Amino acid sequence: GEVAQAIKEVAKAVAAAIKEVAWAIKEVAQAIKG
Amino acid sequence: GEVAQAIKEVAKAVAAAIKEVAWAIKEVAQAIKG
Amino acid sequence: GEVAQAIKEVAKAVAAAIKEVAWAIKEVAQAIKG
Amino acid sequence: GEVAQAIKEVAKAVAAAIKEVAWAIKEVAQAIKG
Amino acid sequence: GEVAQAIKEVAKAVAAAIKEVAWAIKEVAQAIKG
Amino acid sequence: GEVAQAIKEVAKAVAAAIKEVAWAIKEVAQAIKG
Amino acid sequence: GEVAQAIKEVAKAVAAAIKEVAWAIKEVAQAIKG
Ligand code: NA
Ligand code: NA
């Protein structure tokens, strides 16, 4: 159904974007270590 | 449907904004490295 | 409809607030760089 | 309606909290500048 | 209604947790200043 | 009801995860202080 | 039901992603400490 599919898109898109934030923060850690 | 379309808008808008956060954090990493 | 409109308000308000976070992080990068 | 009002409360409360995060990050930038 | 009440709980719990993030970031600002 | 229960699970899981972020940021503050 | 299951997926995916952010921030704390 369209509502369920839209909610699954929230899960997918928002989780993926938040994982991009996590990766950027790992890049901060790497810069500090360097 | 309007509810499904609104939920898709949450996915799109919130994910895009979170990506902006990731990019800004990458700028912090670059600032430290430099 | 009121439910769809409320969900659109979540998209708008939450995305805008997250963009403010991104901008503040840009300010951190600028501070580090001098 | 109660569901629409509850969703509006999500928009208001979560956006306001995220703005507090943005402001705290601005304070970090000003600390670094000092 | 149970759905409206659950949505209100999202607003309450998620906003409160995000405020804790803001407070922690203020601690980082204070640590830098010290 | 299953929808209300699922929404309550969003409140619980997401708030708890955000609290982990707050703690991690307190650890950054401690690292800077030390 | 499909809507309830989709909402549970939001809880799971978004919480997991936010935990990844917490772990990345811990890496920053460790980098500062080192
Ligand atoms: Na980068
Ligand atoms: Na990650």
Author numbering:
A (entry chain C), B (entry chain A), C (entry chain B), D (entry chain F), E (entry chain G), F (entry chain D), ...: 1 to 34
Copy the relevant paper text.
De novo coiled coils (CCs) are particularly appealing modules for designing self-assembling systems as they are short, mutable, and sequence-to-structure relationships governing their folding and assembly are well established. For example, CC-Tri and CC-Tet exchanged with each other, as did the higher-order CCs, CC-Pent2, CC-Hex2, and CC-Hept. These two classes—i.e., CC-Tri plus CC-Tet, and CC-Pent2, CC-Hex2 plus CC-Hept—are structurally distinct: the trimer and tetramer have consolidated hydrophobic cores, whilst the others have central channels and are α-helical barrels. Similarly, peptides with Type II interfaces where the g, a, d, and e residues all engage in helix–helix interactions—namely the pentameric, hexameric, and heptameric α-helical barrels, CC-Pent2, CC-Hex2 and CC-Hept—also exchange with each other. To address this, using the insight from the data and analysis presented here, we have tested two different strategies for increasing specificity of coiled coils: (i) alternate placement of salt bridge-promoting residues, lysine and glutamate to discriminate the tetramer from the trimer; and (ii) incorporation of hendecad repeats to separate the α-helical barrels.
Variations of this 3-4 spacing can lead to alternative CC sequences and structures. For instance, in 11-amino acid, hendecad repeats core-forming residues are spaced 3-4-4 apart at the a, d, and h sites of a → k repeats.16,63–67 Consequently, while heptad repeats drive association of left-handed CCs, hendecads lead to right-handed quaternary structures.16,63–67 We reasoned that replacing heptad with hendecad repeats at different locations in the pentamer, hexamer, and heptamer sequences should alter the hydrophobic seams and, in turn, might confer homo-specificity in the resulting sequences. For CC-Pent2 and CC-Hept, initially, we replaced the third and second heptads, respectively, with hendecad repeats to give CC-Pent2-hen3 and CC-Hept-hen2, and using the Leu-at-h variants for both. Unfortunately, FAM-CC-Hept-hen2 was not soluble in PBS buffer, so we switched to a heptamer sequence with Ile in the a sites and Val at d and h (CC-Hept-IV-hen2). This proved more soluble and retained orthogonality. However, overall, this revised set of peptides showed significant improvements in orthogonality across the whole set compared with the original basis set going into this study. The second strategy differentiates the α-helical barrels, CC-Pent2, CC-Hex2, and CC-Hept, by introducing hendecad repeats in a pentamer and heptamer to give CC-Pent2-hen3 and CC-Hept-IV-hen2. Fluorescence measurements show minimal exchange between a revised set of CC peptides: CC-Di, CC-Tri, CC-Tet*, CC-Pent2-hen3, CC-Hex2, and CC-Hept-IV-hen2. We have denoted this group of peptides as the Orthogonal Coiled-coil basis set.
